[PDB]
Structure formats: C-alpha cells, structure tokens
C-alpha cells in the first residue's frame, strides 16, 4: 500500500493497485478537488471538476457489485467470469473496472 | 512541430509547445473524443467527455484575446503584461494560458 506510505522519488501511488507504478504529477498546481486520474489509476496534472467519493465499502454495494478504487462507487462486477490468459493483463473500463478482454 | 511529425519512441507531442516533451499515453484505449490532456499539454489515458474544437484562428478572436492551443478557443489574453523572470517559467491556468506567476 502506497495510499498511506507514499512513494519513492520518481514514482507516485496507483490508486487502483496501491503500488508505486505511476510517474507522478509533473506540476504543483493547486486542484480544489484533486488531480484527475487515468482509468488505470495514475494522477496527472489536470484538476477534477467534482470531488471523488471519499470512501467505499462492499456493505454499501448492490448484489453482484463491488467498489471501484477509481471512483469509490459500486461500479464493478464482482464476477466478470473471465478465463482468459493475457500477458498485459485484462482491460479496465472508464470506471477502472476489469473486464474480460486482454490489454493490447 | 510534432503536431504533424510525431515523436521519437518514449516521447509524445505537447500540443501547447509543439515539442516532444511528453511521456505519452501508457495505454491503447479507444477514446471516441480523444485523450484528456494536462493543462501543460500532455495526453494521458483518460477519455475526453466531449470533442476538442478542431481548429482556432486569431481572426475568430475577440479584442485582446488569442487562441489556446489547449482548447482551440479564444481563451488567452494576448498581453498578460508580465515582466517576471522565472526559472521554471510562467504558470498556465486550466485553459492552458500563461499568466503572471512563476511556476513553483
Ligand atoms: Cl486543470
Ligand atoms: Cl477513461
């Protein structure tokens, strides 16, 4: 987890994987609602237009759904019933949810 | 200009400076309206919600205003009357326009 620890210089926290695999924001802009992220979980230097929901828990979620660490809403299917093998791993959608297609 | 040429591997086109100083998108997502950019002019892997205006010319512009290469709208003051010296150069705002404050 880097969501707490933080990251070595030259890397930033990926909010999806909670690993320091991101490059980090190449600026020092003040963003009232924080920085936007790529759908794969890295911040970049553009301000969000509205706040990210602060927290998410499975207990809040509908049947068959779980939290997205990208959106902190119950956006992701719990079971995407996917039996593909991928080198790059699976694609994520715009809500940061994996679905059953290999990353190109 | 990289807006046409394109960029060497490991770098991508900065739409503001038209120099290959960007890292490039670390994905192969299809975005119907293209990728979002940081306010300093680099694409990242999140899809735009609406299209960028395709083209901008000064002739379209109000008095005292010129095109933003970020937005292709007449967003920037032509004269920000700024006589600061900055190592990092001047800040840009969310429309990609310079204004009279040194980058931290
Ligand atoms: Cl911004
Ligand atoms: Cl996206």
Swiss-Prot record, chains A, B:
Disulfide bonds: 2-13, 7-20, 22-42, 27-45, 31-47, 56-67, 61-74, 76-97, 82-100, 86-102
UniProt site (Reactive bond): 28-29, 83-84
Protein's cellular compartments: Secreted
A GO molecular-function descriptor: serine-type endopeptidase inhibitor activity
Keyword vocabulary terms for this entry: Disulfide bond, Heparin-binding, Protease inhibitor, Pyrrolidone carboxylic acid, Repeat, Secreted, Serine protease inhibitor, Signal
Entry's family note: Belongs to the protease inhibitor I15 (antistasin) family.
Name recorded for this polypeptide: Antistasin
Species in which this protein is naturally found: Haementeria officinalis (Mexican leech)
